[PDB]
Write a protein that binds this ligand. Structure first.
Ligand SMILES: CN1CCN(C(=O)N2CCC[C@H](C(=O)Nc3ccc(Cl)c(F)c3)C2)CC1
Ligand SMILES: *[C@@H]1O[C@H](CO)[C@@H](O)[C@H](O)[C@H]1NC(C)=O
Ligand SMILES: *[C@@H]1O[C@H](CO)[C@@H](O)[C@H](O)[C@H]1NC(C)=O
Ligand SMILES: *[C@@H]1O[C@H](CO)[C@@H](O)[C@H](O)[C@H]1NC(C)=O
Ligand SMILES: *[C@@H]1O[C@H](CO)[C@@H](O)[C@H](O)[C@H]1NC(C)=O
Ligand SMILES: *[C@@H]1O[C@H](CO)[C@@H](O)[C@H](O)[C@H]1NC(C)=O
Ligand SMILES: *[C@@H]1O[C@H](CO)[C@@H](O)[C@H](O)[C@H]1NC(C)=O
Ligand SMILES: *[C@@H]1O[C@H](CO)[C@@H](O)[C@H](O)[C@H]1NC(C)=O
Ligand SMILES: *[C@@H]1O[C@H](CO)[C@@H](O)[C@H](O)[C@H]1NC(C)=O
Ligand SMILES: *[C@@H]1O[C@H](CO)[C@@H](O)[C@H](O)[C@H]1NC(C)=O
Ligand SMILES: *[C@@H]1O[C@H](CO)[C@@H](O)[C@H](O)[C@H]1NC(C)=O
Ligand SMILES: *[C@@H]1O[C@H](CO)[C@@H](O)[C@H](O)[C@H]1NC(C)=O
Ligand SMILES: *[C@@H]1O[C@H](CO)[C@@H](O)[C@H](O)[C@H]1NC(C)=O
Ligand SMILES: [Cl-]
Ligand SMILES: [Cl-]
Ligand SMILES: [Cl-]
Length: 340
């Protein structure tokens, strides 16, 4: 017996001692070691309701990642609303590791094992756990990288598909590799390579799944309509450097003579509109040498256009900005309950 409840969670890592990587340091002092014997209990003939868009676990992970970045990626200057906070900005080692989220004594986490679960409503194959799985806290926009995959069909996640202000999260069932490099000695010029055949097959599957959700209206893809740069381009952190990569060849190279390698131009930016809170951070120029990260695109952040009620189309643009949807894309299958 149990009921929905919220409590202070704790985290669990496989952080290594002596390793200077920032996630390792943070998790070494802020998390416990992984449960070496983690036990799950299937609950026979139990249906439990979940809401991924209203889940306090999301906000707690968010607060954790804010604190991590606050202690690790210190910008040279931070213009944080009139304030000019100055400090050192040594180049650090940066590579996210999996974090587990665990309930204290008296509470438990319920986890949905429905292979079709969209994050909202009833779940029929429920199990009980003490900790989530290892979730890498990957900050990104437009594309979710290095996450899990849907176990069968592509899942569409939204708090309300008919409300165009509510973000759509696409959960892919087959990752697509994005391979990004800034070559060794424009020091801020970089680029990302993606397989065109794989990308366009995945995007065609995505449009047809979307067609299932919008009475077979024609699904159109377009790039963002205004933003700060962090939203209009695919923005991520690779080895401590902030990459901004133009993706109109992803959402506007129709191919729905193009089955080859897509190259997206990129810039490493020093001034950044932060995601942790409104304000500006200025870091230092990129490190010397080859800067490379090979990531899996495992989900997409989308926003549907409004005012197409009286049209036969629905146009979607890549989105992002609020990283709680990033954590939501992995925490969707979890919810905390107080055990009575
Ligand atoms: C709610 N809360 C308020 C303040 N916020 C904001 O004002 N934003 C507007 C400008 C862009 C912001 C962003 O996403 N920055 C970013 C920076 C680095 C990386 Cl690697 C990245 F992937 C993304 C979103 C955040 C949301
Ligand atoms: C429900 O999910 C659990 C967890 O993996 C597993 O036993 C199986 O996939 C499902 N059980 C049944 C009886 O289908
Ligand atoms: C990328 O995807 C492949 C296949 O889906 C998977 O085996 C691999 O673990 C993924 N890479 C990372 C870094 O998660
Ligand atoms: C992914 O899901 C789609 C459904 O939209 C399905 O047609 C496709 O076969 C799936 N791909 C894989 C690799 O399972
Ligand atoms: C998710 O599934 C529930 C129950 O099947 C349904 O009510 C809800 O509309 C679905 N959400 C989406 C976005 O498809
Ligand atoms: C979803 O959005 C539509 C459009 O604004 C609204 O009519 C509907 O009430 C919303 N659903 C819920 C559950 O609030
Ligand atoms: C990624 O891109 C670089 C530069 O084109 C290339 O050397 C490398 O082989 C590519 N693939 C991987 C897996 O790094
Ligand atoms: C992209 O994936 C397809 C299979 O979907 C494969 O035939 C092709 O070789 C891949 N691209 C490259 C550059 O190898
Ligand atoms: C969508 O189109 C398919 C064609 O494969 C058709 O069978 C189905 O009835 C249509 N459904 C809606 C909701 O438009
Ligand atoms: C991305 O590149 C295209 C040219 O291919 C350009 O029209 C567009 O303005 C670029 N995006 C941004 C945000 O500048
Ligand atoms: C892509 O959309 C942009 C608007 O951001 C526009 O500049 C361009 O014409 C479109 N691409 C193609 C290939 O038409
Ligand atoms: C994604 O995971 C790979 C494998 O560990 C890593 O090399 C890459 O840097 C990661 N990408 C990001 C953006 O963290
Ligand atoms: C568009 O239609 C949906 C329901 O089909 C409704 O909830 C929404 O308010 C409408 N928007 C406008 C601007 O008429
Ligand atoms: Cl423990
Ligand atoms: Cl404890
Ligand atoms: Cl933007």
């Amino acid at each position: 017996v149990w009921k929905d409840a919220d409590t202070t969670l704790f985290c669990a890592s496989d952080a290594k001692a002596y390793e200077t990587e920032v996630h390792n340091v943070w998790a070494t002092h802020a998390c416990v070691p992984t449960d070496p014997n983690p036990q799950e209990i299937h609950l026979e003939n139990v249906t439990e309701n979940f809401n991924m868009w209203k889940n306090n676990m999301v906000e707690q992970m968010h607060e954790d990642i804010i604190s991590l970045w606050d202690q690790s990626l210190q910008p040279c200057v931070k213009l944080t609303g009139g304030s000019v906070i100055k400090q050192a900005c040594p180049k650090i080692s940066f590579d996210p590791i999996p974090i587990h989220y665990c309930t204290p004594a008296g509470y438990v986490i319920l986890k949905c094992n429905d292979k079709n679960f969209n994050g909202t409503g009833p779940c029929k194959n429920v199990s009980s756990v003490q900790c989530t799985h290892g979730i890498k806290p990957v900050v990104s926009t437009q594309l979710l990288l290095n996450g899990s995959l849907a176990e069968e069909e592509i899942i569409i996640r939204s708090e309300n598909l008919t409300n165009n202000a509510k973000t759509i999260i696409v959960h892919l069932n087959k990752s697509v590799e994005i391979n990004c490099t800034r070559p060794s000695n424009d020091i801020r010029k970089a680029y990302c390579e993606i397989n065109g055949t794989k990308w366009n097959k995945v995007l065609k599957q995505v449009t047809e799944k979307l067609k299932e959700h919008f009475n077979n209206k024609t699904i159109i893809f377009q790039p963002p309509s205004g933003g700060d740069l962090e939203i209009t381009m695919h923005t991520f952190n690779c080895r401590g450097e902030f990459f901004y990569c133009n993706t109109t060849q992803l959402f506007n190279n129709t191919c729905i003579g193009c089955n080859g390698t897509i190259t997206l131009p990129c810039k490493i930016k020093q001034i950044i509109n932060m995601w942790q809170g409104t304000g500006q951070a200025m870091y230092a120029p990129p490190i010397d040498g080859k800067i490379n990260c090979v990531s899996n695109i495992t989900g997409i952040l989308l926003t549907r256009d409004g005012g197409a009620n009286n049209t036969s189309n629905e146009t979607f643009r890549p989105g992002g900005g609020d990283m709680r949807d990033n954590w939501r894309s992995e925490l969707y299958k979890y919810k905390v309950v107080q055990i009575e």
